[PDB]
Protein backbone atom coordinates (compact mmCIF):
# COMPACT_ATOMS: atom_id res chain seq x y z
CA UNK A 1 0.00 0.00 0.00
CA UNK A 2 1.19 3.50 -0.96
CA UNK A 3 -0.28 7.01 -1.11
CA UNK A 4 0.24 9.11 -4.23
CA UNK A 5 -0.50 12.81 -3.80
CA UNK A 6 -0.88 15.62 -6.32
CA UNK A 7 -1.45 19.28 -5.47
CA UNK A 8 -1.55 22.19 -7.91
CA UNK A 9 -2.57 25.80 -7.37
CA UNK A 10 -2.38 28.44 -10.09
CA UNK A 11 -2.65 32.21 -10.40
CA UNK A 12 -2.09 34.96 -12.94
CA UNK A 13 1.49 36.19 -12.63
CA UNK A 14 2.97 39.67 -13.01
CA UNK A 15 3.39 38.87 -16.72
CA UNK A 16 -0.35 38.25 -17.09
CA UNK A 17 0.29 34.56 -17.71
CA UNK A 18 -1.08 31.59 -15.79
CA UNK A 19 1.68 30.25 -13.55
CA UNK A 20 2.09 27.69 -10.78
CA UNK A 21 1.62 29.34 -7.38
CA UNK A 22 2.17 26.16 -5.38
CA UNK A 23 2.53 22.47 -6.13
CA UNK A 24 3.47 19.12 -4.61
CA UNK A 25 3.58 15.54 -5.85
CA UNK A 26 4.52 12.01 -4.84
CA UNK A 27 5.46 9.07 -7.09
CA UNK A 28 4.50 8.21 -9.66
CA UNK A 29 3.16 11.72 -10.33
CA UNK A 30 5.31 14.52 -11.74
CA UNK A 31 4.42 17.88 -13.29
CA UNK A 32 6.33 19.72 -16.01
CA UNK A 33 6.66 23.51 -16.10
CA UNK A 34 3.78 25.10 -18.03
CA UNK A 35 4.06 26.27 -21.62
CA UNK A 36 1.63 28.48 -23.51
CA UNK A 37 -0.22 27.23 -26.58
CA UNK A 38 -2.46 30.25 -27.08
CA UNK A 39 -1.53 33.64 -25.63
CA UNK A 40 -4.61 32.96 -23.51
CA UNK A 41 -3.88 29.41 -22.36
CA UNK A 42 -1.34 27.58 -20.22
CA UNK A 43 -0.59 23.88 -20.54
CA UNK A 44 0.87 21.65 -17.84
CA UNK A 45 1.93 18.09 -18.64
CA UNK A 46 1.25 15.49 -15.96
CA UNK A 47 3.38 12.41 -16.44
CA UNK A 48 3.46 9.09 -14.61
CA UNK A 49 5.07 5.70 -15.04
CA UNK A 50 3.74 3.03 -12.71
CA UNK A 51 3.24 -0.74 -12.37
CA UNK A 52 -0.31 0.09 -11.30
CA UNK A 53 -2.41 0.12 -8.14
CA UNK A 54 -2.54 -2.78 -5.68
CA UNK A 55 -4.73 -3.53 -2.66
CA UNK A 56 -4.76 -0.57 -0.29
CA UNK A 57 -3.27 1.94 -2.72
CA UNK A 58 -4.81 5.41 -2.74
CA UNK A 59 -4.50 8.51 -4.89
CA UNK A 60 -5.43 12.00 -3.74
CA UNK A 61 -5.57 14.87 -6.21
CA UNK A 62 -6.20 18.53 -5.41
CA UNK A 63 -6.47 21.11 -8.19
CA UNK A 64 -7.02 24.80 -7.48
CA UNK A 65 -7.24 27.00 -10.56
CA UNK A 66 -7.02 30.63 -9.45
CA UNK A 67 -9.20 33.36 -11.01
CA UNK A 68 -8.67 34.20 -14.70
CA UNK A 69 -6.32 31.24 -15.11
CA UNK A 70 -6.97 29.27 -18.27
CA UNK A 71 -5.25 25.93 -17.91
CA UNK A 72 -5.02 22.63 -19.76
CA UNK A 73 -3.57 19.56 -18.05
CA UNK A 74 -2.48 16.82 -20.45
CA UNK A 75 -1.22 13.28 -19.83
CA UNK A 76 -0.43 10.05 -21.67
CA UNK A 77 -0.62 7.62 -18.75
CA UNK A 78 -3.04 4.74 -18.21
CA UNK A 79 -4.05 3.74 -14.69
CA UNK A 80 -3.81 -0.02 -14.25
CA UNK A 81 -5.76 -1.54 -11.35
CA UNK A 82 -4.44 -4.95 -10.34
CA UNK A 83 -6.06 -7.82 -8.49
CA UNK A 84 -6.90 -6.20 -5.15
CA UNK A 85 -8.07 -9.42 -3.48
CA UNK A 86 -10.39 -8.67 -0.56
CA UNK A 87 -9.41 -5.00 -0.65
CA UNK A 88 -9.51 -2.16 -3.15
CA UNK A 89 -7.66 0.79 -4.67
CA UNK A 90 -9.06 4.30 -4.68
CA UNK A 91 -8.73 7.70 -6.32
CA UNK A 92 -10.03 10.89 -4.73
CA UNK A 93 -10.05 14.21 -6.54
CA UNK A 94 -11.06 17.64 -5.32
CA UNK A 95 -11.01 20.33 -7.98
CA UNK A 96 -11.72 24.03 -7.55
CA UNK A 97 -12.05 26.47 -10.44
CA UNK A 98 -12.17 30.21 -9.76
CA UNK A 99 -13.77 33.27 -11.33
CA UNK A 100 -13.40 33.41 -15.12
CA UNK A 101 -11.00 30.49 -14.87
CA UNK A 102 -10.88 27.59 -17.33
CA UNK A 103 -9.78 24.00 -16.74
CA UNK A 104 -9.33 21.14 -19.19
CA UNK A 105 -8.67 17.94 -17.25
CA UNK A 106 -9.09 14.17 -17.17
CA UNK A 107 -7.74 11.50 -14.81
CA UNK A 108 -5.78 8.59 -16.28
CA UNK A 109 -7.93 6.15 -18.30
CA UNK A 110 -8.85 3.18 -16.10
CA UNK A 111 -7.72 -0.34 -16.96
CA UNK A 112 -9.13 -2.73 -14.32
CA UNK A 113 -7.50 -6.17 -14.32
CA UNK A 114 -9.20 -9.36 -13.17
CA UNK A 115 -10.59 -9.05 -9.64
CA UNK A 116 -9.71 -5.37 -9.49
CA UNK A 117 -11.82 -3.34 -7.07
CA UNK A 118 -11.68 0.40 -7.72
CA UNK A 119 -13.34 3.31 -5.94
CA UNK A 120 -13.18 6.82 -7.34
CA UNK A 121 -14.67 10.02 -6.00
CA UNK A 122 -14.46 13.35 -7.78
CA UNK A 123 -15.88 16.66 -6.64
CA UNK A 124 -15.60 19.77 -8.78
CA UNK A 125 -16.39 23.24 -7.45
CA UNK A 126 -16.95 26.00 -10.00
CA UNK A 127 -18.09 29.61 -10.02
CA UNK A 128 -20.83 30.75 -12.40
CA UNK A 129 -18.19 32.31 -14.65
CA UNK A 130 -15.88 29.27 -14.51
CA UNK A 131 -15.41 27.02 -17.54
CA UNK A 132 -14.79 23.27 -17.45
CA UNK A 133 -13.77 20.54 -19.86
CA UNK A 134 -13.74 17.34 -17.82
CA UNK A 135 -13.80 13.71 -18.94
CA UNK A 136 -13.07 10.12 -17.90
CA UNK A 137 -12.26 6.99 -19.90
CA UNK A 138 -13.04 3.46 -18.70
CA UNK A 139 -11.73 0.31 -20.36
CA UNK A 140 -13.22 -3.18 -19.99
CA UNK A 141 -9.82 -4.53 -18.97
CA UNK A 142 -6.73 -5.69 -20.84
CA UNK A 143 -8.51 -6.07 -24.17
CA UNK A 144 -5.43 -7.55 -25.88
CA UNK A 145 -5.57 -10.75 -23.82
CA UNK A 146 -9.36 -10.85 -24.09
CA UNK A 147 -9.68 -9.87 -20.44
CA UNK A 148 -13.10 -8.19 -20.59
CA UNK A 149 -15.12 -7.25 -17.52
CA UNK A 150 -13.16 -9.69 -15.36
CA UNK A 151 -12.62 -7.11 -12.63
CA UNK A 152 -14.47 -7.33 -9.32
CA UNK A 153 -16.22 -4.00 -8.96
CA UNK A 154 -15.69 -0.47 -10.21
CA UNK A 155 -17.50 2.46 -8.62
CA UNK A 156 -16.68 6.04 -9.56
CA UNK A 157 -18.65 9.22 -8.94
CA UNK A 158 -18.55 12.79 -10.19
CA UNK A 159 -20.34 15.76 -8.64
CA UNK A 160 -20.05 19.27 -10.03
CA UNK A 161 -21.14 22.33 -8.04
CA UNK A 162 -21.68 25.77 -9.54
CA UNK A 163 -21.65 28.43 -6.82
CA UNK A 164 -22.11 25.64 -4.26
CA UNK A 165 -25.15 24.27 -6.12
CA UNK A 166 -25.15 20.81 -7.79
CA UNK A 167 -25.44 20.98 -11.59
CA UNK A 168 -24.31 17.48 -12.55
CA UNK A 169 -24.00 13.98 -11.13
CA UNK A 170 -22.46 10.80 -12.46
CA UNK A 171 -22.70 7.48 -10.64
CA UNK A 172 -20.73 4.77 -12.42
CA UNK A 173 -21.09 1.26 -11.00
CA UNK A 174 -19.75 -1.67 -13.00
CA UNK A 175 -20.07 -5.13 -11.47
CA UNK A 176 -19.75 -8.20 -13.74
CA UNK A 177 -21.35 -10.32 -11.00
CA UNK A 178 -24.69 -8.48 -11.18
CA UNK A 179 -24.93 -7.80 -14.91
CA UNK A 180 -23.71 -8.73 -18.36
CA UNK A 181 -21.77 -5.52 -18.97
CA UNK A 182 -21.64 -6.47 -22.65
CA UNK A 183 -25.41 -6.13 -23.10
CA UNK A 184 -26.73 -3.64 -25.66
CA UNK A 185 -27.64 -1.09 -22.96
CA UNK A 186 -24.19 -1.06 -21.37
CA UNK A 187 -20.97 -1.63 -23.37
CA UNK A 188 -22.78 -3.31 -26.27
CA UNK A 189 -19.76 -5.13 -27.70
CA UNK A 190 -17.42 -2.16 -27.30
CA UNK A 191 -14.53 -2.03 -24.83
CA UNK A 192 -13.71 1.64 -24.22
CA UNK A 193 -16.02 4.20 -22.64
CA UNK A 194 -15.70 7.98 -22.72
CA UNK A 195 -17.79 10.23 -20.49
CA UNK A 196 -17.25 13.97 -20.88
CA UNK A 197 -18.88 17.19 -19.72
CA UNK A 198 -18.52 20.70 -21.11
CA UNK A 199 -19.62 23.37 -18.66
CA UNK A 200 -20.08 26.96 -19.79
CA UNK A 201 -17.93 26.48 -22.88
CA UNK A 202 -18.13 28.75 -25.98
CA UNK A 203 -19.49 25.97 -28.17
CA UNK A 204 -22.84 24.81 -29.52
CA UNK A 205 -24.46 21.37 -29.54
CA UNK A 206 -24.22 21.04 -33.33
CA UNK A 207 -20.49 21.71 -33.34
CA UNK A 208 -19.83 18.88 -30.89
CA UNK A 209 -22.22 16.61 -32.80
CA UNK A 210 -20.16 17.31 -35.93
CA UNK A 211 -16.94 16.09 -34.31
CA UNK A 212 -18.58 12.89 -33.11
CA UNK A 213 -20.14 12.21 -36.50
CA UNK A 214 -16.78 12.78 -38.21
CA UNK A 215 -14.87 10.45 -35.85
CA UNK A 216 -14.01 6.99 -37.17
CA UNK A 217 -14.43 4.01 -34.86
CA UNK A 218 -16.74 5.77 -32.41
CA UNK A 219 -20.38 5.28 -31.43
CA UNK A 220 -21.03 8.55 -29.62
CA UNK A 221 -23.51 11.31 -28.82
CA UNK A 222 -23.96 14.65 -27.08
CA UNK A 223 -26.90 16.21 -25.25
CA UNK A 224 -27.88 19.17 -23.10
CA UNK A 225 -28.04 18.52 -19.37
CA UNK A 226 -30.74 19.92 -17.08
CA UNK A 227 -28.35 22.69 -16.03
CA UNK A 228 -27.96 23.60 -19.72
CA UNK A 229 -24.48 22.19 -20.26
CA UNK A 230 -23.14 19.54 -22.63
CA UNK A 231 -22.49 15.86 -21.94
CA UNK A 232 -20.67 13.57 -24.34
CA UNK A 233 -20.76 9.78 -24.14
CA UNK A 234 -18.91 7.52 -26.57
CA UNK A 235 -18.08 3.85 -26.99
CA UNK A 236 -15.15 2.45 -28.95
CA UNK A 237 -13.02 -0.65 -29.48
CA UNK A 238 -9.76 1.14 -28.76
CA UNK A 239 -8.58 4.15 -26.77
CA UNK A 240 -7.20 6.05 -29.78
CA UNK A 241 -10.56 6.92 -31.38
CA UNK A 242 -11.83 8.23 -28.04
CA UNK A 243 -8.71 10.27 -27.28
CA UNK A 244 -8.82 11.63 -30.82
CA UNK A 245 -12.46 12.58 -30.30
CA UNK A 246 -11.62 14.39 -27.05
CA UNK A 247 -8.77 16.27 -28.71
CA UNK A 248 -11.08 17.49 -31.48
CA UNK A 249 -13.61 18.66 -28.89
CA UNK A 250 -10.89 20.33 -26.80
CA UNK A 251 -9.63 22.04 -29.96
CA UNK A 252 -13.13 23.39 -30.68
CA UNK A 253 -13.47 24.83 -27.17
CA UNK A 254 -10.03 26.44 -27.47
CA UNK A 255 -10.49 28.16 -30.82
CA UNK A 256 -11.78 31.37 -29.25
CA UNK A 257 -9.78 34.60 -29.26
CA UNK A 258 -9.05 37.32 -26.69
CA UNK A 259 -9.14 39.80 -29.57
CA UNK A 260 -12.89 39.48 -30.18
CA UNK A 261 -16.09 39.59 -28.13
Amino acid sequence: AQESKLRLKTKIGADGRCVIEDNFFTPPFKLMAPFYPKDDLAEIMLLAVSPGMMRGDAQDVQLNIGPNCKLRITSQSFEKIHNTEDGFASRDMHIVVGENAFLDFAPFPLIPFENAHFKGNTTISLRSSSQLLYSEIIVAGRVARNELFKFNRLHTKISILQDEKPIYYDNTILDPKTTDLNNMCMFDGYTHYLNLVLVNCPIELSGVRECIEESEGVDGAVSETASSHLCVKALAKGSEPLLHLREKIARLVTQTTTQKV
Binding site: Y169, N171, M184, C185
Partner: protein, 229 residues
Amino acid sequence: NAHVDNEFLILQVNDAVFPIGSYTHSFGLETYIQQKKVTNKESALEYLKANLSSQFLYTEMLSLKLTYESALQQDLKKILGVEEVIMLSTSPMELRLANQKLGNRFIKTLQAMNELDMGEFFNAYAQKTKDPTHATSYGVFAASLGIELKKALRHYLYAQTSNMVINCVKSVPLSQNDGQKILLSLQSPFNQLIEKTLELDESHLCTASVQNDIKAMQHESLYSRLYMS
Protein backbone atom coordinates in the same frame (compact mmCIF):
# COMPACT_ATOMS: atom_id res chain seq x y z
CA ASN B 1 -69.42 7.23 -5.34
CA ALA B 2 -67.18 8.30 -2.45
CA HIS B 3 -65.84 4.75 -2.18
CA VAL B 4 -62.32 4.66 -3.62
CA ASP B 5 -61.13 1.08 -3.92
CA ASN B 6 -57.35 0.73 -4.21
CA GLU B 7 -57.77 -2.63 -5.94
CA PHE B 8 -59.44 -0.82 -8.83
CA LEU B 9 -57.44 2.39 -8.57
CA ILE B 10 -54.11 0.58 -9.06
CA LEU B 11 -55.52 -0.94 -12.25
CA GLN B 12 -56.82 2.43 -13.44
CA VAL B 13 -53.53 4.36 -13.07
CA ASN B 14 -51.52 1.53 -14.69
CA ASP B 15 -54.06 1.11 -17.47
CA ALA B 16 -52.48 1.51 -20.90
CA VAL B 17 -55.13 4.17 -21.60
CA PHE B 18 -54.39 6.26 -18.51
CA PRO B 19 -53.96 9.62 -20.30
CA ILE B 20 -50.32 10.64 -19.74
CA GLY B 21 -49.00 9.98 -23.24
CA SER B 22 -46.77 6.96 -22.65
CA TYR B 23 -47.50 5.58 -26.13
CA THR B 24 -45.69 8.56 -27.68
CA HIS B 25 -42.36 7.58 -26.09
CA SER B 26 -39.77 4.91 -26.86
CA PHE B 27 -37.18 6.10 -24.32
CA GLY B 28 -34.48 5.33 -26.87
CA LEU B 29 -35.93 2.10 -28.26
CA GLU B 30 -36.65 3.75 -31.62
CA THR B 31 -32.95 4.52 -31.99
CA TYR B 32 -32.13 0.86 -31.35
CA ILE B 33 -34.64 -0.13 -34.02
CA GLN B 34 -33.53 2.26 -36.77
CA GLN B 35 -29.89 1.23 -36.23
CA LYS B 36 -31.09 -2.37 -36.63
CA LYS B 37 -29.88 -3.57 -33.22
CA VAL B 38 -33.43 -4.70 -32.48
CA THR B 39 -34.66 -6.53 -35.58
CA ASN B 40 -36.63 -9.55 -34.34
CA LYS B 41 -38.21 -11.40 -31.41
CA GLU B 42 -34.86 -12.55 -30.05
CA SER B 43 -33.08 -9.18 -30.17
CA ALA B 44 -36.12 -7.40 -28.73
CA LEU B 45 -36.17 -9.67 -25.68
CA GLU B 46 -32.44 -9.07 -25.20
CA TYR B 47 -33.03 -5.33 -25.36
CA LEU B 48 -35.79 -5.51 -22.75
CA LYS B 49 -33.72 -7.61 -20.34
CA ALA B 50 -30.79 -5.26 -20.92
CA ASN B 51 -32.88 -2.12 -20.43
CA LEU B 52 -34.93 -3.43 -17.50
CA SER B 53 -31.82 -4.52 -15.61
CA SER B 54 -30.09 -1.17 -16.14
CA GLN B 55 -31.96 2.10 -16.71
CA PHE B 56 -35.35 0.87 -15.49
CA LEU B 57 -33.89 -0.82 -12.40
CA TYR B 58 -31.52 1.81 -10.98
CA THR B 59 -33.54 4.87 -11.95
CA GLU B 60 -37.22 4.00 -12.36
CA MET B 61 -37.84 1.10 -9.97
CA LEU B 62 -35.24 2.19 -7.41
CA SER B 63 -36.52 5.77 -7.26
CA LEU B 64 -40.08 4.47 -7.03
CA LYS B 65 -39.13 2.49 -3.94
CA LEU B 66 -37.17 5.41 -2.49
CA THR B 67 -40.01 7.92 -2.67
CA TYR B 68 -42.45 5.24 -1.49
CA GLU B 69 -40.40 4.53 1.64
CA SER B 70 -39.89 8.23 2.35
CA ALA B 71 -43.63 8.83 1.92
CA LEU B 72 -44.34 6.28 4.66
CA GLN B 73 -42.25 8.46 6.97
CA GLN B 74 -43.64 11.71 5.56
CA ASP B 75 -40.08 12.65 4.59
CA LEU B 76 -40.68 15.20 1.84
CA LYS B 77 -37.14 16.60 1.84
CA LYS B 78 -35.79 13.14 1.03
CA ILE B 79 -38.29 12.76 -1.81
CA LEU B 80 -37.22 16.10 -3.32
CA GLY B 81 -33.61 15.05 -2.81
CA VAL B 82 -34.20 11.94 -4.91
CA GLU B 83 -35.97 13.86 -7.69
CA GLU B 84 -33.10 16.38 -7.83
CA VAL B 85 -30.50 13.62 -8.22
CA ILE B 86 -32.48 12.05 -11.07
CA MET B 87 -32.76 15.39 -12.87
CA LEU B 88 -29.04 16.16 -12.54
CA SER B 89 -28.03 12.58 -13.41
CA THR B 90 -30.14 12.04 -16.53
CA SER B 91 -27.95 13.54 -19.26
CA PRO B 92 -30.00 12.39 -22.29
CA MET B 93 -32.36 15.34 -22.78
CA GLU B 94 -35.32 13.53 -24.34
CA LEU B 95 -35.08 10.87 -21.64
CA ARG B 96 -35.08 13.55 -18.95
CA LEU B 97 -37.92 15.51 -20.57
CA ALA B 98 -40.00 12.39 -21.20
CA ASN B 99 -39.84 11.26 -17.58
CA GLN B 100 -40.61 14.78 -16.33
CA LYS B 101 -43.57 15.18 -18.69
CA LEU B 102 -45.02 11.83 -17.62
CA GLY B 103 -44.53 12.85 -14.00
CA ASN B 104 -46.32 16.15 -14.55
CA ARG B 105 -49.24 14.63 -16.45
CA PHE B 106 -49.59 11.84 -13.89
CA ILE B 107 -50.03 14.32 -11.02
CA LYS B 108 -52.37 16.54 -13.04
CA THR B 109 -54.45 13.53 -14.07
CA LEU B 110 -54.94 12.53 -10.43
CA GLN B 111 -55.74 16.18 -9.71
CA ALA B 112 -58.43 16.31 -12.41
CA MET B 113 -60.27 13.58 -10.50
CA ASN B 114 -61.90 15.77 -7.84
CA GLU B 115 -63.59 12.86 -6.06
CA LEU B 116 -60.16 11.33 -5.46
CA ASP B 117 -58.71 12.50 -2.16
CA MET B 118 -55.01 11.61 -2.14
CA GLY B 119 -54.51 12.72 1.46
CA GLU B 120 -52.55 15.49 3.14
CA PHE B 121 -49.03 14.23 2.47
CA PHE B 122 -49.53 13.66 -1.25
CA ASN B 123 -51.13 17.09 -1.49
CA ALA B 124 -48.06 18.62 0.15
CA TYR B 125 -45.73 16.64 -2.12
CA ALA B 126 -47.62 17.73 -5.24
CA GLN B 127 -47.41 21.37 -4.13
CA LYS B 128 -43.67 21.37 -3.40
CA THR B 129 -42.35 19.02 -6.11
CA LYS B 130 -40.29 20.70 -8.86
CA ASP B 131 -39.17 17.81 -11.07
CA PRO B 132 -41.41 14.79 -10.48
CA THR B 133 -41.06 11.74 -12.69
CA HIS B 134 -43.70 9.12 -13.41
CA ALA B 135 -41.86 6.74 -11.05
CA THR B 136 -41.23 9.10 -8.12
CA SER B 137 -44.72 10.63 -8.17
CA TYR B 138 -46.24 7.15 -8.48
CA GLY B 139 -44.18 5.98 -5.51
CA VAL B 140 -45.56 8.68 -3.24
CA PHE B 141 -49.00 7.93 -4.69
CA ALA B 142 -48.86 4.24 -3.75
CA ALA B 143 -47.58 4.84 -0.22
CA SER B 144 -50.12 7.60 0.38
CA LEU B 145 -52.92 5.11 -0.29
CA GLY B 146 -51.40 2.23 1.65
CA ILE B 147 -50.82 0.05 -1.39
CA GLU B 148 -48.25 -2.64 -0.66
CA LEU B 149 -44.83 -1.98 -2.21
CA LYS B 150 -44.26 -5.24 -4.10
CA LYS B 151 -47.78 -4.98 -5.50
CA ALA B 152 -47.16 -1.36 -6.51
CA LEU B 153 -43.86 -2.28 -8.18
CA ARG B 154 -45.43 -5.25 -9.97
CA HIS B 155 -48.14 -3.23 -11.70
CA TYR B 156 -45.78 -0.40 -12.61
CA LEU B 157 -43.20 -2.85 -13.97
CA TYR B 158 -45.66 -4.78 -16.12
CA ALA B 159 -47.33 -1.64 -17.47
CA GLN B 160 -44.07 -0.05 -18.59
CA THR B 161 -42.75 -3.27 -20.09
CA SER B 162 -46.04 -3.80 -21.93
CA ASN B 163 -45.67 -0.34 -23.48
CA MET B 164 -42.13 -1.21 -24.57
CA VAL B 165 -43.18 -4.59 -25.97
CA ILE B 166 -45.98 -2.91 -27.92
CA ASN B 167 -43.59 -0.39 -29.47
CA CYS B 168 -41.40 -3.31 -30.57
CA VAL B 169 -44.45 -5.01 -32.09
CA LYS B 170 -45.50 -1.81 -33.86
CA SER B 171 -42.06 -0.64 -34.94
CA VAL B 172 -39.79 -3.63 -35.60
CA PRO B 173 -42.33 -4.96 -36.37
CA LEU B 174 -43.21 -8.21 -34.61
CA SER B 175 -46.30 -10.42 -34.70
CA GLN B 176 -48.66 -9.86 -31.78
CA ASN B 177 -48.04 -13.41 -30.53
CA ASP B 178 -44.34 -12.57 -30.46
CA GLY B 179 -45.16 -9.81 -27.99
CA GLN B 180 -47.05 -12.26 -25.79
CA LYS B 181 -44.20 -14.77 -25.87
CA ILE B 182 -41.81 -12.01 -24.82
CA LEU B 183 -44.08 -10.75 -22.02
CA LEU B 184 -44.38 -14.32 -20.73
CA SER B 185 -40.61 -14.90 -20.92
CA LEU B 186 -40.04 -11.86 -18.73
CA GLN B 187 -42.05 -13.03 -15.72
CA SER B 188 -39.13 -14.62 -13.89
CA PRO B 189 -36.89 -11.63 -14.65
CA PHE B 190 -39.78 -9.45 -13.38
CA ASN B 191 -39.62 -11.21 -10.01
CA GLN B 192 -35.82 -10.91 -9.96
CA LEU B 193 -35.96 -7.17 -10.63
CA ILE B 194 -38.44 -6.58 -7.81
CA GLU B 195 -36.32 -8.75 -5.52
CA LYS B 196 -33.27 -6.68 -6.45
CA THR B 197 -35.08 -3.35 -6.02
CA LEU B 198 -35.76 -4.14 -2.37
CA GLU B 199 -32.05 -4.94 -1.84
CA LEU B 200 -30.75 -1.72 -3.42
CA ASP B 201 -30.17 1.50 -1.47
CA GLU B 202 -29.79 5.08 -2.69
CA SER B 203 -26.06 4.66 -3.31
CA HIS B 204 -27.20 2.78 -6.42
CA LEU B 205 -29.60 5.52 -7.54
CA CYS B 206 -29.13 6.45 -11.21
CA THR B 207 -26.38 3.90 -11.83
CA ALA B 208 -24.98 4.98 -15.18
CA SER B 209 -26.04 3.16 -18.32
CA VAL B 210 -23.72 3.45 -21.30
CA GLN B 211 -25.10 2.52 -24.72
CA ASN B 212 -28.63 3.19 -23.51
CA ASP B 213 -27.74 6.82 -22.69
CA ILE B 214 -25.95 7.16 -26.04
CA LYS B 215 -28.93 5.81 -28.00
CA ALA B 216 -31.36 8.07 -26.11
CA MET B 217 -29.17 11.04 -27.03
CA GLN B 218 -28.85 9.92 -30.66
CA HIS B 219 -32.65 9.82 -30.94
CA GLU B 220 -32.42 13.62 -31.13
CA SER B 221 -30.59 13.33 -34.45
CA LEU B 222 -32.82 10.81 -36.22
CA TYR B 223 -34.29 12.41 -39.35
CA SER B 224 -37.56 10.48 -39.13
CA ARG B 225 -38.84 9.99 -35.58
CA LEU B 226 -42.28 8.63 -34.78
CA TYR B 227 -41.62 8.92 -31.03
CA MET B 228 -40.93 11.82 -28.66
CA SER B 229 -38.00 9.91 -27.16
